[PDB]
């Protein structure tokens, strides 16, 4: 029922293909079974940030989750952009403000996980997940310190390129 085109992304848990039934979507097909909380929170974070209808689960016959059909995101990898305009500074703050406003504590703040769209001057995160405060493993303090560090680090990368 999903119709995959060319590979456009590889990850530790998934291969991302064009959706041949819809130019605006991609198919993130899991290479091994994910926990329900992982799938659900990926879909939720993506819909929260990009808008409702932006991500949905793909099911097989047995009713297992085999993937996520998601919006293709605009922009080019920040890895491939040596140099940014001064105005990109406010753009990386805007991204973080939009995430925080939703109560998402963006985890993966690496250069690999962000796209920059120079025409619109916006940064778009690719894989969105949040820290989750829990008993003993992740306290509010640990989360805040980790989140803050990753935010400063990505902002630092952006400012270095300006």
């Amino acid at each position: 029922s999903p119709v995959p085109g060319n590979v456009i992304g590889k990850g530790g848990n998934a291969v991302v293909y064009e959706d041949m039934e819809d130019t605006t979507k991609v198919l993130k097909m899991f290479t091994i079974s994910q926990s329900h909380e992982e799938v659900t929170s990926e879909v939720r974070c993506f819909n929260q940030y990009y808008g409702s209808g932006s991500a949905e689960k793909i099911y097989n016959d047995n009713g297992n989750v085999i993937g996520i059909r998601m919006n293709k995101i605009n922009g080019e990898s920040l890895l491939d952009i040596p140099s940014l305009p001064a105005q990109a500074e406010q753009a990386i703050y805007d991204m973080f403000d939009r995430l925080e406003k939703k109560g998402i504590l963006f985890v993966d703040t690496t250069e690999t996980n962000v796209l920059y769209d120079r025409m619109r001057n916006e940064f778009n995160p690719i894989d969105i997940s949040s820290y989750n405060v829990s008993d003993i493993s992740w306290s509010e303090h640990q989360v805040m310190q980790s989140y803050h560090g990753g935010k400063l680090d990505l902002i630092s990368v952006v400012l270095s390129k300006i």
Side-chain angles (χ1 to χ4, degrees), residues 1-100 102-162:
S1 278
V3 191
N6 291 319
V7 172
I8 57 197
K10 293 279 173 67
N13 63 336
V15 180
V16 180
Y17 302 87
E18 295 163 325
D19 182 354
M20 290 215 294
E21 301 182 303
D22 190 339
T23 310
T24 67
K25 305 293 198 173
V26 304
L27 305 172
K28 182 186 279 218
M29 303 310 287
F30 298 122
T31 53
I32 194 168
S33 300
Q34 310 293 283
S35 76
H36 305 113
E37 28 272 287
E38 261 176 324
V39 176
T40 299
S41 97
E42 180 154 10
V43 168
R44 173 161 62 224
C45 290
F46 210 77
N47 285 327
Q48 274 173 358
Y49 186 89
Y50 286 112
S52 59
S54 285
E56 61 177 30
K57 303 168 177 176
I58 306 171
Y59 294 93
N60 63 13
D61 288 323
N62 180 37
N64 311 140
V65 173
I66 61 173
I68 311 175
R69 176 174 287 103
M70 315 169 76
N71 285 12
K72 196 174 289 172
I73 303 162
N74 294 324
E76 296 299 324
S77 177
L78 186 51
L79 286 168
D80 305 325
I81 302 176
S83 195
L84 285 172
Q87 69 189 13
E89 179 180 356
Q90 181 55 51
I92 198 58
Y93 302 150
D94 291 352
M95 184 189 79
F96 276 109
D97 297 334
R98 172 163 184 91
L99 286 159
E100 292 176 7
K102 309 291 182 181
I104 291 168
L105 306 176
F106 196 27
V107 174
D108 185 359
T109 49
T110 69
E111 225 174 319
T112 298
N113 195 34
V114 195
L115 298 169
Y116 182 65
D117 176 339
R118 62 177 191 211
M119 184 182 68
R120 297 176 181 87
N121 189 33
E122 37 194 54
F123 285 93
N124 298 318
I126 295 162
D127 289 330
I128 306 174
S129 58
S130 172
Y131 287 95
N132 302 291
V133 156
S134 84
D135 9 42
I136 204 186
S137 54
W138 291 103
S139 73
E140 179 65 25
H141 189 255
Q142 296 160 327
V143 165
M144 288 294 118
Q145 185 182 16
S146 291
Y147 169 67
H148 188 70
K151 176 172 169 178
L152 286 172
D153 187 76
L154 177 51
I155 288 175
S156 173
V157 170
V158 165
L159 296 184
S160 293
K161 292 172 183 286
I162 285 182

